[PDB]
Amino acid sequence: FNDPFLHELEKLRRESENSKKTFEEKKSILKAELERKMAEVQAEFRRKFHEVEAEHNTRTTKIEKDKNLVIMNKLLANAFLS
Amino acid sequence: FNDPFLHELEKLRRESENSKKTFEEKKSILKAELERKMAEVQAEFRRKFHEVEAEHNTRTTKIEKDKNLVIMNKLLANAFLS
């Protein structure tokens, strides 16, 4: 640059494009970290939850086998009479 | 319960009622801590964000005041006639 004024002015217009830039990018990084932490906190939830739900379905098919062993040994030892 | 068959049956209604109880309550807890983890991941993203936004607005007024300071200086050294 010839004019040390037009110079300083560009040195600063440039200086504020770096500003606008590193800001725009940080802004993106965070947005993209939050996105990932949230998808991973919700996949940790979905995990434990499908285990809790499994534990129960097995809990109740047990309770289930048995309820029907009762109803059978009853119905059986009772047609032994009629 | 006089009837022993009726007894086995009640013993089971009672067991299935705790299957449901502890399941629904396990469920209720996992959901409670999802709320809590997500709430705080996202309320510390904002804490981190506003700190870049802040950091930028200060950078930018810094520049703005270098600019202004350099323009007026030109304007003054150049404050005459003919």
Author numbering:
A (entry chain A), B (entry chain B): 1732 to 1813
From the study:
Arabidopsis MORPHEUS' MOLECULE1 (MOM1) is an exceptional TGS regulator that acts largely independently of changes in the levels of DNA methylation and H3K9me2. MOM1 is a large nuclear protein of 2001 amino acids containing an incomplete and highly degenerate helicase domain related to a similar domain found in CHD3 chromatin-remodeling factors. Surprisingly, only the predicted nuclear localization signal (NLS) and a short fragment of MOM1 of less than 200 amino acids (1663 to 1859) containing a conserved plant-specific motif of 82 amino acids (1734 to 1815), named Conserved MOM1 Motif 2 (CMM2), is required for TGS activity. We solved the structure of this domain and found that it forms a dimer with each monomer consisting of unusual consecutive 11 amino-acid hendecad repeats folding into an antiparallel coiled-coil.
The best diffracting crystals were obtained with a MOM1 fragment corresponding to amino acid positions 1700 to 1814 (for experimental details, see and Materials and methods) and a complete dataset was collected to a maximal resolution of 3.2 Å. A poor electron density map, most likely the result of the absence of stable secondary structure, prevented us from building the first 28 as well as the last 3 amino acids of the CMM2-containing fragment. The structure reveals that the CMM2 motif folds as a long α-helix. Two such helices form an antiparallel coiled-coil structure. The asymmetric unit contains two identical coiled-coils that further interact via their N- and C-termini to form the crystal lattice. The mutual association of two CMM2 monomers occurs mainly through a large interface formed by hydrophobic residues. Additional stabilization of the coiled-coil comes from an intermolecular network of salt bridges established between glutamate and lysine residues. In contrast to the classical coiled-coil structure, CMM2 monomers are not wound around each other and, therefore, do not generate a left-handed super-coil. The CMM2 fragment forms dimeric coiled-coils with extensive hydrogen bonds or salt bridges mediating inter-chain contacts via residues at positions g and k.
